[PDB]
Design an enzyme around this catalytic site. Structure first.
Site, mmCIF file in Angstrom:
data_model
loop_
_atom_site.group_PDB
_atom_site.id
_atom_site.type_symbol
_atom_site.label_atom_id
_atom_site.label_comp_id
_atom_site.label_asym_id
_atom_site.label_seq_id
_atom_site.Cartn_x
_atom_site.Cartn_y
_atom_site.Cartn_z
ATOM 1 N N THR C 1 5.059 -1.813 4.846
ATOM 2 C CA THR C 1 4.886 -0.461 5.439
ATOM 3 C C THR C 1 3.432 -0.053 5.439
ATOM 4 O OG1 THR C 1 7.086 0.300 4.770
ATOM 5 C CG2 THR C 1 5.417 1.986 5.237
ATOM 6 N N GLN C 2 2.969 0.364 6.605
ATOM 7 C CA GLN C 2 1.590 0.802 6.793
ATOM 8 C C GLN C 2 1.546 2.327 6.892
ATOM 9 O OE1 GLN C 2 -0.879 -1.546 6.561
ATOM 10 N NE2 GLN C 2 0.844 -2.984 6.347
ATOM 11 N N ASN C 104 0.720 -5.595 2.971
ATOM 12 C CA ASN C 104 1.924 -4.980 3.516
ATOM 13 C C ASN C 104 2.756 -4.441 2.344
ATOM 14 O OD1 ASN C 104 4.089 -4.275 5.240
ATOM 15 N ND2 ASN C 104 4.972 -6.312 5.015
#
Ligand SMILES: [Mg+2]
Ligand SMILES: [Mg+2]
Ligand SMILES: [Mg+2]
Ligand SMILES: [Mg+2]
Ligand SMILES: [Mg+2]
Ligand SMILES: [Mg+2]
Ligand SMILES: [Mg+2]
Ligand SMILES: [Mg+2]
Ligand SMILES: [Mg+2]
Ligand SMILES: [Mg+2]
Ligand SMILES: [Mg+2]
Lengths: 213, 238, 217, 234, 202, 233, 245, 220, 204
Positions: C1-2, C104
């Site tokens: 998740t960014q 990530n």
């Protein structure tokens, strides 16, 4: 965006005498303007005569520490002996260099005894550049502790002084002083100060107290 | 012989000769013994020397602080399996910061050594193993064979003339669980001696001992270090 | 998740005599929107360890998925071995660090609560892999509003009882409601003791708004 | 009769590994002896022609300043193992900044033991064992040491050991002459005395290689002259 | 876009507008945002048309195989899981706001939300899409436990009507669909059929 | 879990022969007969669609297949192998068109497919195709007729036959017909050369025929077939 | 019939009469194994195995021939143990992946079809050899009830009410047909399982032995568990006593 | 570009301007924008010419291979599927905006496919820079079940709206009619643009161009 | 911009039973001339030429790689490439580099190898083709060139009134473009001959 790094503070110091090595670090772990915990010493025992202290990004110190531990076990199974303080230092150098393009944000200091029985101290930068020293400090208080040691332990800037060897007793108090003075100016240093003493007899620990502010 | 050269070939009798043959490799190796009290796991083994000017073969190896092993069969295969065993343990500590449960490690050897017995061109591992360890379920003595099969033992012994040792162990089992270390080791040394030609016995040069237990990390004893155990050994064959 | 999407705010954890307690509101925020008002941000990882997560709820569900399978796997062996609190906390640190190193991350800060061998376990874990143990834990805003209270109490009485502790948690969950703009006065309380892991249904706290009438004066 | 290279015999032994042990018996003979003052290695070059440079025949080589190694059997094969060894000693030095023990080096080489196979294998994979026997002689933290290693991957330490065609005989003589207290001087003499016996040709100073490694001096390959000096006492 | 789903005893109600824009231009004022995933399972889509279409076909393919393989009606929870798996796994490359509602011989009527992040949660009723922000208060003050396939079917009609009124990104016609054991019935509400509310005057 | 045989299954014997290829041809010589005639204004392909029982639905499957809008095929030998080659020819036909924007020249399609057939006489783990093909096409005015067999070798024929009695079927044509034959003419002399072996009651479902004139390739319907059958049409 | 002239060395070769001798040979390995039985009660499935005493030196619990493949599925095996264990790992992995993907416990019929296709994969090539083992899968749930499946070296899979694999496949069946499991409760079947075991067990040839019993049904709450020592003993006594008749 | 399509009583009608531009300059006054998929399926393309070509050619090619095996005639959903799944896979880098139309065993189908891969099933659609102009014509004058001629001109009227009102469109109006039994590919359908009549003379008379080097070569 | 780095201009025109193709000769790097004798038109068989404008490296590369393909095509096929086919061949070669294209927009001019048919076309740097019955341009002065062409081209032209027409279009367009010029070359192809002249032009 997303940074994979954080600065947790904490300093690390080490001195080597004729027959002993000392490794000290405050015990505060922080982030931002907060304190994660007041009880988090950066000193860890690798062998019966080799101690390492790690400061910087705690995420990396933890990982690095576990990597070193495993690699010593491997060396033991492989050569039937434990790793000499010098080989551990040489190894840590290559381990740090493997992340040359994505560094372990870490400042390590190794404190122990060489095969000849004498005290030894090795300092490293995050990517493995290292050397041996009489004494060295890394971390936030780094520039705070050093100067006093250059003077007191290195008899620098002093004319007609007695170059007496660092008696383990005098050392132990030098350590407590610079850390107590540092605890006064570096918001990162405080809470407590753990020391690890390495001698022919083994490794002995001592925990002095520091300002909780 | 159409059914003897490939482990992927079943015989009309529901057997796999290659596997059996590999088992033979174990029998050839010098005998070794294993047994546990309720607080200690002990490995005992007889080492061989090619000629008189050569040293005796290693038979006991350190895997991790709570695990050690004795080998019988191809040495190269012992080293492969030992290194697998060592690696698996290092991983456990790395990820979970706890020692790999001995029984779980045994299941991995079982899975790992089974694979090659079912694929064309591959061969069974040619080594047996006695595993001595101590986890939160106490002492353990396991046995693993060239056929991916493994066993949880009260005591055991593989190798040449190990049939005698097995017999001796089967007779004094009830005693084991309550033995104190030195007595447990003696039973071991005693059983090993069963596998020898009457005109010779245990020397501080041909005996190796491995001990792990609630009070001690796996440790190996090889030469002068073996004396303390050999002393008080009734040269009373039986 | 960014980019975190639906998230959960602070998480608290304090240990007491023979157990540990964790608290987390049931809110899933989407920016400034209290979107999902009834979701559990606590999980039971086997009989001696529980977990509470701040951050991206989707990632948390993921960890909850992997951890659940892990426990199941272990239970199948019924070999008399089972992950301890420290073990789960150790694995989580390796996991969070691994993902952080691939750039990530799983966008969560978590509190691991456990009890095993008469000792209390309480551990912290970042999405960057910073991990440590301590008698009291507070993530998110809780680290600025709750942790000062918790420590205050413990610097004058290191040992609390399941009741003294639950009293502190309620007091903190109130302060959080008063000051954290992304909190919800509807939480859960999980407790671990020799008896196991217990999670308590939708709770709330008495709130006092009498200062509202002090505009003029 | 055609089977895989990794097939077991009813006896529980791999055919290939057994068939190469056989190949060693066709190699020249070499001897290694271990003394508290050092270790020495000797081998008969076994020259097959006057037109062949006796020097372009090295059955004894340096692995590292503190380690020498003598070979026998299909020498072409030994080339590879010898290199892996030298490379290994340097990787160790690179990483740990300290010399590698003689035991660890021998072991490292032994791991390429049964590293051969067909199916389920890489492209640059061995297809058969190495038909070689080796003797690693050197000095380290544990004093002078000699190790022997054959194709089965097995290796062990020896006070004195012989490999090659005359191995059986040579070893018999070595058992008669070895003294746990003898010297590097005595040692070298025995080596040549025995080597002289077993050789089918008359022991020349140009048909044998001798080298030593002692607690002080780093690996040394005896000169054509230094051989004359020792051979002087046939 | 404005999507919504409600659970009632033996089934579910699903509603969505028909507007799909690119900027401020309506490329389709009659879009069908309720997609059939399986005989009695549907999903409402909001976000990238290309993403929601591509994902739905993928789930339909995945689910169709799963059921034939089991020779059984698929669970609504399973269909939700398959969306959640793709939407979580590719969360950085998808822009999908999904609601899955349908009937389950084993669990009956159900509605699951799988928003942007890839999380999945079951709800009495769910709302998604740009327009959803304008109908929270409404929906919170109107939802009643125990509504009928009729009350519900009318409840979403109002919510979608209100939302379509205020959101530029929503409008067109209101499509509905009710699913229950008996089967699936889909209707549409053009112009006048669309609930109305007088624009405040003097 | 599957691996793969990397050694070739076809290998020269001391006689210098490629055994598997000969044997492949034997599978051909044993297959339903086929005839091809290049009438200098269109080509014709016809074969014996002998179906056992009457239960077989002659429709569902064909032996005379269209490769491109202007190419066509028939074979003699193993039906399943054929099918494979039909999919590959059609495919090869498209890869040509996408690149050049011009339908693939018949000679070129033959060369390409022949290369494939040759591939299966050297690659590991495989046996040669047990089939022989007759490709017909109208590329650039002139009509073409080719034959490629297991070996991967091909030849251009004015007319020929393969399969059972291909020896007699050839000699028959070796005289029973010649160039300048117009359309419908070559078709008759083709269905005739077929009957020169066709054991049984050769009807409109016992055979299948396709023609390739300089205006596309197509298969003739049971109608146009039932017709030519009455010894005319 | 002595067929076997090269026609029995590879699973990728059919005999002149349409058989794959390698698979058949793998089954023999199973027919030589000790008997294991499974019986679908009305509220679960029960498992029992004649685990022969290889040596008195082995612990009770060594070489278990019963495993938990998932928390609601049990696996009873016969034949080459090492082969069986790897099939148990595959079963586990399959059941675990299913939950991760579809999000709910795997249906026994599916776990069985899946593992079966994996078994079957190993009966088509020369590159590998058929598993020398057979196993049963047992489970219970309220929405599925009790289910019993059995897969063999060929990959074939089927559902049963009762079934046996091993030395006495036949002898065990004729004894199972005597029970009316369809109406029987699991708590009572344990006895009958241990009963059919002692009957079938060859007091002569095969020496001493141990009894392994598996649990799964409404009585276990859906979780496949080992049968409580208490129930086991009772079932052992009942079996032994019923033997003296 | 202005491309559009409509669904009428007996089938489908596709329109398209014929201008191609390299920046703000007209490169081709007569580009062919209505592409052939199958004999019963046609596609108009707007966007990156090359992309509109190759994608359209590939789907065509793949469908000739498809029906060549099924033995049946291609369906529109198939072209739609193939096209959308490919474009989607390239996340928008293949700049192809398509108006797909054809007649099935299931009837006349009109789909609009965007470069990112989403599609719209509609009775009338438009794409390209002139799409808003064209869409106006439709929204104002569209009726279901129009007769061939009643649609055949609604489309040329919308492609016209584009042509004049969008600098990105011009030149001729091409058409394509596809019904259950017919396929009228009307290339020039209308030509409302003519180059103004040259009012002067410039013909270069032999010898006016000074040469510096000559060299001939005879062929055969 | 990348395309105008070396500068350059290329043009093709259609006559009655003939075809023309011309190109400037300058090879420069930004402001600086480097060469005056730079080939930009390449023979791709008799009565078939390709003209490449744009980035010098790709000009040379696209041409060399195209020859590679053209030769084999002619060795496998038993013929001489047909114009419409060479165009499709270049359209394929360029598009294989769709997401990292060669920087050159080709111009094709020629006569059917087995017919009179004159043929001209140009392409995208990514392979999109364009065929016309009048002319085609490519280079840094597309605009200037279109100017001349839309005012000098006549439907049917004998080889000489074509040469004088295309020669005027170039020289005049190229003279209002700072990076194109240093001489022009023309190729006029007739079923019987190939006339190649290098016009007289400015050298600034
Ligand atoms: Mg980021
Ligand atoms: Mg610490
Ligand atoms: Mg402070
Ligand atoms: Mg035929
Ligand atoms: Mg089968
Ligand atoms: Mg019974
Ligand atoms: Mg049961
Ligand atoms: Mg315009
Ligand atoms: Mg020419
Ligand atoms: Mg100029
Ligand atoms: Mg100039």
């Amino acid at each position: 965006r997303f940074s994979p790094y954080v600065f947790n503070g904490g300093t690390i110091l080490a001195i080597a005498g004729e027959d002993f090595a000392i490794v000290a670090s405050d015990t505060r772990l922080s982030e931002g303007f907060s304190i994660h915990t007041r009880d988090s010493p950066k000193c860890y025992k690798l062998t019966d005569k080799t101690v390492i202290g790690c400061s910087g990004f705690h995420g990396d110190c933890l990982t690095l520490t576990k990597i070193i531990e495993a690699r010593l076990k491997m060396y033991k199974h492989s050569n039937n002996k434990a790793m000499t303080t010098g080989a551990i230092a040489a190894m840590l150098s290559t381990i740090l260099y493997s992340r040359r393009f994505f560094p372990y944000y870490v400042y390590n200091i190794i404190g122990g005894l060489d095969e000849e029985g004498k005290g030894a101290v090795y300092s490293f930068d995050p990517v493995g550049s290292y050397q041996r020293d009489s004494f060295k400090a890394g971390g936030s208080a780094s520039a705070m502790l050093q100067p006093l040691l250059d003077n007191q332990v290195g008899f620098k800037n002093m004319q007609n002084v007695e170059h007496v060897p660092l008696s383990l007793d005098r050392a132990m108090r030098l350590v407590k002083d610079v850390f107590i003075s540092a605890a006064e100016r570096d918001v990162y240093t405080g809470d407590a100060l753990r020391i690890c003493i390495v001698t022919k007899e083994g490794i002995r620990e001592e925990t002095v107290s520091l300002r909780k502010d | 012989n159409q059914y003897d050269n490939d482990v992927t070939v079943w015989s009309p009798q529901g057997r796999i000769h290659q596997i059996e043959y590999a088992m033979e490799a174990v029998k050839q190796g010098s005998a070794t013994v294993g047994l546990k009290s309720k607080t200690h796991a002990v490995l005992v083994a007889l080492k061989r020397a090619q000629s008189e000017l050569a040293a005796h073969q290693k038979k006991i190896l350190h895997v991790d602080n709570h695990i050690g092993i004795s080998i019988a069969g191809l040495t190269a295969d012992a080293r492969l399996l030992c290194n697998f065993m060592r690696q698996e343990c290092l991983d456990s500590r790395f990820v979970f910061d706890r020692p790999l449960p001995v029984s779980r490690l045994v299941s991995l050897i079982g899975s790992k050594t089974q694979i090659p017995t079912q694929r064309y061109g591959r061969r069974p591992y040619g080594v047996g193993l006695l595993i001595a360890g101590y986890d939160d379920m106490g002492p353990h003595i396991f046995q693993t064979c060239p056929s991916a099969n493994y066993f949880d033992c009260r005591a055991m012994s593989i190798g040449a003339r190990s049939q005698s040792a097995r017999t001796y162990l089967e007779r004094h089992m009830s005693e084991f669980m309550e033995c104190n270390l030195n007595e447990l080791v003696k039973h071991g040394l005693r059983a090993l001696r069963e596998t020898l030609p009457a005109e010779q016995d245990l020397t501080t040069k041909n005996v190796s001992i491995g001990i792990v237990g609630k009070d001690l990390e796996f440790t190996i004893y090889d030469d002068d270090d073996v004396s303390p155990f050999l002393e008080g050994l009734e040269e009373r064959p039986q | 998740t960014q980019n975190p999407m639906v998230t959960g705010t602070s998480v608290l954890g304090v240990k007491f005599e023979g157990g540990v307690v964790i608290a987390a509101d049931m809110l899933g925020s989407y920016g400034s929107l209290a979107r999902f008002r009834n979701i559990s941000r606590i999980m039971r990882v086997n009989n001696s360890t529980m977990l509470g997560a701040s951050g991206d709820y989707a990632d948390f569900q993921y960890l909850k998925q992997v951890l659940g399978q892990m426990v199941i796997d272990e239970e199948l062996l019924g070999d008399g071995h089972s992950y301890s609190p420290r073990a789960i906390h150790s694995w989580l640190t390796r996991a969070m660090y691994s993902r952080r190193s691939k750039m990530n991350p799983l966008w969560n800060t978590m509190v691991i609560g456990g009890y095993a061998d008469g000792e209390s376990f309480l551990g912290y874990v970042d999405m960057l892999g910073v991990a440590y143990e301590a008698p009291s834990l507070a993530t998110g805003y809780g680290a600025y509003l709750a942790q000062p209270l918790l420590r205050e109490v413990l610097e004058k009485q290191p040992v609390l009882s399941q009741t003294e502790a639950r009293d502190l948690v309620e007091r903190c969950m109130r302060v959080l409601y008063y000051r954290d703009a992304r909190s919800y006065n509807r939480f859960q309380t999980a407790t671990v003791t020799e008896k196991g892991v217990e999670i308590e249904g939708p709770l709330s706290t008495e709130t006092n708004w009498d200062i509202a009438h002090m505009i003029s004066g | 009769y055609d089977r895989g290279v990794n097939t077991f015999s009813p006896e529980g032994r791999l055919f290939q590994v057994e068939y190469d042990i056989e190949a060693i018996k066709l190699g020249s003979t070499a001897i290694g002896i271990q003394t508290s003052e050092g270790v020495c290695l000797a081998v008969e070059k076994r020259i097959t022609s006057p037109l062949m440079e006796p020097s372009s025949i090295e059955k004894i080589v340096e692995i590292d300043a503190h380690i020498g190694c003598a070979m026998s059997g299909l020498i072409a094969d030994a080339k590879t193992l010898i290199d892996k060894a030298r490379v290994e000693t340097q990787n160790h030095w690179f990483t740990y900044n300290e010399t590698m023990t003689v035991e660890s080096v021998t072991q490292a080489v032994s791991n390429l033991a049964l590293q051969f196979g067909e199916e389920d294998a890489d492209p640059g994979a061995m297809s058969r064992p190495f038909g070689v026997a080796l003797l690693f002689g050197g000095v380290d933290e544990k004093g002078p040491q000699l190790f022997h290693m054959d194709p089965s991957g097995t290796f062990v330490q020896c006070d004195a050991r012989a490999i090659g065609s005359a191995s059986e005989g040579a070893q018999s003589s070595l058992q008669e002459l070895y003294h746990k207290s003898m010297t590097l001087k005595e040692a070298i003499k025995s080596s040549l005395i025995i080597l002289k016996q077993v050789m089918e040709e008359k022991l020349n100073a140009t048909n044998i290689e001798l080298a030593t490694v002692q607690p002080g001096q780093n690996f040394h390959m005896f000169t054509k002259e230094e051989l004359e000096e020792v051979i002087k006492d046939i | 876009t404005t999507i919504m789903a409600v659970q009632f005893d033996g089934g579910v109600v699903l509603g969505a507008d028909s507007r799909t824009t690119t900027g401020s231009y309506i490329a389709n004022r009659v879009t069908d945002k309720l997609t059939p995933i399986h005989d009695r399972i549907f999903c409402c889509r909001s976000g990238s048309a290309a993403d929601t279409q591509a994902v739905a076909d993928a789930v339909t393919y995945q689910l169709g195989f799963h059921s034939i393989e089991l020779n059984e009606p698929p669970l609504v929870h399973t269909a939700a899981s398959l969306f959640k798996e793709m939407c979580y796994r590719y969360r950085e490359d998808l822009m999908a706001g999904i609601i899955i509602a349908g009937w389950d011989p084993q669990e009956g009527g159900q509605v699951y939300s799988v928003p942007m992040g890839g999380m999945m949660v079951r709800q009495s009723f769910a709302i998604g899409g740009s327009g959803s922000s304008y109908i929270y208060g409404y929906v919170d003050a109107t939802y009643r436990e125990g509504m009928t396939k009729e009350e519900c079917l009318q409840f979403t009609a109002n919510a979608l009507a209100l939302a379509m009124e205020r959101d530029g990104s929503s409008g067109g016609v209101i499509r509905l669909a009710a699913i229950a054991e008996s089967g699936v019935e889909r209707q549409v509400l053009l112009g006048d059929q669309i609930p109305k509310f007088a624009v405040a005057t003097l | 879990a599957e691996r793969g045989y990397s050694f070739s299954l076809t290998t020269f014997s001391p006689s210098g022969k490629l055994v598997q290829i000969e044997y492949a041809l034997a599978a051909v010589a044993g297959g339903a007969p086929s005839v091809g005639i290049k009438a200098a204004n269109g080509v014709v392909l016809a074969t014996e669609k002998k179906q056992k029982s009457i239960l077989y639905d002659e429709r569902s499957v064909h032996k005379v297949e269209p490769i491109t809008k202007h190419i066509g095929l028939v074979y003699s030998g193993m039906g399943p192998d054929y099918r494979v080659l039909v999919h590959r020819a059609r495919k090869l036909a498209q890869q040509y068109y996408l690149v050049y924007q011009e339908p693939i020249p018949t000679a070129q399609l033959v060369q390409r497919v022949a290369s494939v057939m040759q591939e299966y006489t050297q690659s590991g783990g495989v046996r040669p195709f047990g089939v022989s093909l007759l490709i017909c096409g109208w590329n650039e005015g002139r009509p073409y007729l080719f034959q490629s067999d297991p070996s991967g070798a091909y030849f251009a024929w004015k007319a020929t036959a393969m399969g059972k009695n291909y020896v007699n079927g050839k000699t028959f044509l070796e005289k029973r017909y010649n160039e300048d034959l117009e359309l419908e003419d070559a078709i008759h002399t083709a269905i005739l050369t077929l009957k020169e072996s066709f054991e049984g009651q050769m009807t409109e479902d016992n055979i299948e025929v396709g023609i390739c004139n300089e205006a596309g390739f197509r298969r003739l319907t049971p109608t146009e077939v039932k017709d030519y059958l009455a010894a005319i049409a | 019939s002595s067929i076997g002239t090269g026609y029995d060395l590879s699973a990728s070769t059919f005999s002149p009469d349409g058989r794959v001798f390698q698979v058949e040979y793998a089954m023999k390995a199973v027919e030589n194994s000790s008997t294991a039985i499974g019986i679908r009660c009305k509220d679960g499935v029960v498992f029992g195995v004649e685990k022969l005493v290889l040596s008195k030196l082995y612990e009770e619990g060594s070489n278990k021939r019963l495993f938990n493949v998932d928390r609601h599925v049990g696996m009873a095996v016969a034949g080459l143990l090492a082969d069986a264990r790897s099939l148990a790992d595959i079963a586990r992995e399959e059941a675990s992946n299913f939950r991760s993907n579809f999000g709910y416990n795997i249906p026994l019929k599916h776990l069985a079809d899946r593992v079966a296709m994996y078994v079957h994969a190993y009966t088509l090539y020369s590159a590998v050899r058929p598993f020398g083992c057979s196993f049963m899968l047992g489970s219970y749930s309220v929405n599925d009830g009790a289910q019993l499946y059995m897969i063999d070296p060929s990959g074939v899979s089927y559902g049963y009410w009762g079934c046996a694999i091993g030395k006495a496949r036949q002898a065990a069946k004729t004894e199972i047909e005597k029970l009316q499991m369809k109406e029987m409760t699991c708590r009572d079947i344990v006895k009958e399982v241990a009963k059919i075991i002692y009957i079938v067990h060859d007091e002569v040839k095969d020496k001493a032995f141990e009894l392994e019993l598996s649990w799964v049904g409404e009585l276990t709450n859906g979780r496949h568990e080992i049968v409580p020592k208490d129930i086991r003993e009772e079932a052992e006594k009942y079996a032994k006593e019923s033997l003296k008749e | 570009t202005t491309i559009a399509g409509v669904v009428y009583k007996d089938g489908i009608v596709l329109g398209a301007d014929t201008r191609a531009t390299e920046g703000m300059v007209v490169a081709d006054k007569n580009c062919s924008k209505i592409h052939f998929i199958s004999p019963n399926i046609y596609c108009c393309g707007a966007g990156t010419a090359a992309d509109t070509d190759m994608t359209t050619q590939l789907i065509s090619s793949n469908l000739e291979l498809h029906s060549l095996s099924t033995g049946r005639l291609p369906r529109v959903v198939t072209a739609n599927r193939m096209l959308k799944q490919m474009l989607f896979r390239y996340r928008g880098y293949i700049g192809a905006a398509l108006v797909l139309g054809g007649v099935d065993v299931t009837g006349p189908h009109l789909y609009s496919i965007y470069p990112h891969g989403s599609t719209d099933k509609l009775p009338y659609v438009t794409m390209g820079s002139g799409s808003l102009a064209a869409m106006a014509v439709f929204e104002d004058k569209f009726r279901p079940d129009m007769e061939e001629e009643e649609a055949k001109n609604l489309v040329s009227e919308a492609i016209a709206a584009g042509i004049f009102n969008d600098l990105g469109s011009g030149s001729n109006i091409d058409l394509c009619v596809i019904s259950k039994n017919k396929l009228d590919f009307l290339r020039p359908y209308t030509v409302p643009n003519k180059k103004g009549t040259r009012l002067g003379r410039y013909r270069c008379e032999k010898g006016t161009t000074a040469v510096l080097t000559e060299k001939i070569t005879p062929l055969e | 911009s990348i395309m105008s780095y070396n500068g350059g201009a290329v043009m093709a025109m259609k006559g009655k039973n003939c075809v023309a193709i011309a190109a400037d000769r300058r090879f420069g790097i930004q402001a600086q001339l480097v060469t005056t004798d730079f080939q930009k038109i390449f023979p791709m068989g008799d009565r078939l030429y390709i003209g490449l404008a744009g980035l010098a490296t790709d000009v040379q590369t696209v041409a060399q790689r195209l020859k590679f393909r053209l030769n084999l095509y002619e060795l496998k096929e038993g013929r001489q490439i047909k114009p419409y086919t060479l165009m499709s061949m270049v359209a394929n070669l360029l598009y294989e580099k769709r997401f990292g294209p060669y920087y050159t927009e080709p111009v094709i001019a020629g006569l059917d190898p087995k017919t009179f048919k004159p043929f001209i076309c140009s392409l995208d740097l990514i392979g999109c083709p364009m065929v016309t019955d009048d002319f085609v341009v490519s280079g840094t002065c597309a605009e200037q060139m279109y100017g001349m062409c839309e005012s000098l081209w006549e439907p049917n032209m004998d080889p000489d009134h074509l040469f004088e027409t295309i020669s005027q279009a170039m020289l005049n367009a190229v003279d209002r473009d700072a990076v194109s010029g240093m001489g022009v070359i023309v190729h006029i192809i007739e079923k019987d001959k190939i006339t190649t002249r290098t016009l007289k032009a400015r050298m600034d």
